[PDB]
Amino acid sequence: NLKQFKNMIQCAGTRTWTSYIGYGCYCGYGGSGTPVDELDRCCYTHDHCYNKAANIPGCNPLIKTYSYTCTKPNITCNDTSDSCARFICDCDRTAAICFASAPYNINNIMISASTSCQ
Amino acid sequence: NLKQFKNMIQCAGTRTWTSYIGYGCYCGYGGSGTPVDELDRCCYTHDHCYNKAANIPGCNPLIKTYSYTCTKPNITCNDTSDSCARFICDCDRTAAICFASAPYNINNIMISASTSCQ
Numbered sequence A, B: 001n002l003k004q005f006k007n008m009i010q011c012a013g014t015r016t017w018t019s020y021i022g023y024g025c026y027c028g029y030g031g032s033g034t035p036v037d038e039l040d041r042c043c044y045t046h047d048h049c050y051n052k053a054a055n056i057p058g059c060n061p062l063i064k065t066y067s068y069t070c071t072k073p074n075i076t077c078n079d080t081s082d083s084c085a086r087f088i089c090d091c092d093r094t095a096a097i098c099f100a101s102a103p104y105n106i107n108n109i110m111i112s113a114s115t116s117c118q
């Protein structure tokens, strides 16, 4: 769930989730346009992942609690049987790791209303 | 913001926000397919409204705090000047009222992974 994703974010990286509340065209809620950079592409992918999670029975991305461990900076998704849990933990882990490895361009904070995301 | 939306939901209607968390193809996070009914239709519109809110400078639909009053069952958006605030309060108020007036089809809880949301 979302609380687990937040913790994964600071497990794998230096910046916490609040850092990605308003970034580029896709970090945070919804979004449109072309992801402006690597980080924004991370968010773009996560969004789609969550939206695909719905196609799984009894699976709501924001509230589904999965099993995972953090051995800072390593995240491990434990689920195998519970497909919804496993799929969503993967969405979140992938994003958390993507955020950590991607550069954070301060120039791209607050651009969603600009020509960039059109 | 989201906490305000949740309170508007119970201001305007009898059901609270949790009964919408997993309804149809669009209530709750993202979604796809055709909205199955009136209520789902409410959620579909609200999702898009939030999407558009992002096209506004310094506007994040989930954390943006606006001004509103509840005189159960009436919701009033007070903002005029703060365009982001006013827009978002409108999205939420519209959704809150829509939810209240729409029938709730228990048959449509948990269908997002079924042919229905295809």
Ligand SMILES: OC[C@H]1O[C@@H](O)[C@@H](O)[C@@H](O)[C@@H]1O
Residues within 6 Å of the ligand: A002, A028, A029, A030, A050, A062, B028, B029, B030, B062
């Ligand atoms: O995708 C992230 C976005 O999804 C929503 O459904 C919520 O949970 C929000 O808190 C969050 O900002």
Ligand SMILES: OC[C@H]1O[C@@H](O)[C@@H](O)[C@@H](O)[C@@H]1O
Residues within 6 Å of the ligand: A028, A029, A030, A031, A047, A048, A051, B028, B029, B030, B031, B047, B048, B050, B051
């Ligand atoms: O990350 C936000 C996610 O929220 C949903 O409610 C819809 O807005 C989707 O279009 C969007 O991808």
Ligand SMILES: [Cl-]
Residues within 6 Å of the ligand: A078, A079, A080, A081, A082
């Ligand atoms: Cl397992």
Ligand SMILES: [Cl-]
Residues within 6 Å of the ligand: B078, B079, B080, B081, B082
């Ligand atoms: Cl005002």
Ligand code: NA
Residues within 6 Å of the ligand: A026, A027, A028, A029, A030, A031, A043, A047
């Ligand atoms: Na997004």
Ligand code: NA
Residues within 6 Å of the ligand: B026, B027, B028, B029, B030, B031, B043, B047
């Ligand atoms: Na939705």
